[PDB]
Symmetry: C3
Subunit: 124 residues, 3 copies
């Protein structure tokens, strides 16, 4: 009764698992560990300062932003960075995970690994 | 009954809106979107590694720190940075929003835009 | 009844105080202010991108990661950085505070000061 599990599918067919815990008027969502995204999962694979991961699945998830430590692997480099992440729903009802970064690079993302991320808050 | 709205005024006459949600012994405060501060809103407009925004308004707000992604516009540059922010009350009862940054610059702030910020926690 | 106080000891004999607040199924832990660690407190004092602080004390603390602003003093430099921190328990039941950073440096930590840190969440 405390929690529910859910998931999303990425464009490349990856599964993002999460668990939601209701704490009265708020919900805390924790993502599954060892999450890795391919460049193919992003709307654009360019390593921009705003990245969009379109999602599919059964239930919307709309959150405040949370801090993550991510690793971005490009052909030539490895970038280890604190980023902010947020689950948002599009005007077309399409769920997205948005990743906000400090510095745009003219490089293509091969992988993004989430090392660790703070729990996500939603105000229900 | 769950929440209350409040606001602060900045030195330049800007309005910071917020909504507070009580979750038993804690309060979660969410700031209004699209917040932009002028250099004139800071105690000092120099782009120091600690920035202070003095506030006026009806009710104190004292919080733990939260992470934000901010944009700092100076005459010559645009800096997009993760920062920590915290609402604190001064020894004189003056409320402040404090912004803590990584790197002091000898430049004057024209604008600070909050792109996104994690909710603020207070332990009541 | 709302809270409990606890502490850990560091290798150099420093005391980390904390206060835990239960909010139904979650616990919020706030660390004592003015925390300073010596290089001697780390498993390795090299300024790596993952730092481990072994702890002793009466009660495990297992948390999600939280953002901190830290100052790292080395012989030659002062680094002011946002980092993520997390309390984890080892396979041997040894509690650790882990600090995750962006950039490894081939320098020895003299001190790490926590300037400010977001509260820690545990899902009980
Ligand atoms: Cl797409
Ligand atoms: Cl994108
Ligand atoms: Cl966060
Ligand atoms: Cl590339
Ligand atoms: Cl002033
Ligand atoms: Cl200032
Ligand atoms: Cl935060
Ligand atoms: Cl300037
Ligand atoms: Cl050790
Ligand atoms: Cl270490
Ligand atoms: Cl955090
Ligand atoms: Cl050194």
């Amino acid at each position: 009764v405390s929690y529910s599990d859910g998931h999303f599918l990425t464009k490349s067919g990856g599964v993002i698992n999460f668990r939601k815990t209701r704490v009265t008027s708020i919900t805390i969502t924790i993502l599954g560990e060892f999450l890795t995204f391919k460049g193919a999962d992003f709307k654009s694979s360019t390593l921009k300062d705003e990245l969009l991961i379109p999602l599919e699945g059964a239930v919307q998830l709309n959150t405040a932003p949370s801090t993550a430590l991510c690793i971005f692997i490009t052909t030539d480099h490895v970038y280890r960075e604190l980023c902010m992440m947020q689950f948002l729903t599009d005007v077309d009802k399409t769920p997205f995970l948005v990743v906000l970064r400090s510095e745009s690079k003219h490089e293509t993302i091969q992988y993004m690994h989430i090392v660790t991320v703070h729990p996500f808050l939603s105000l229900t």
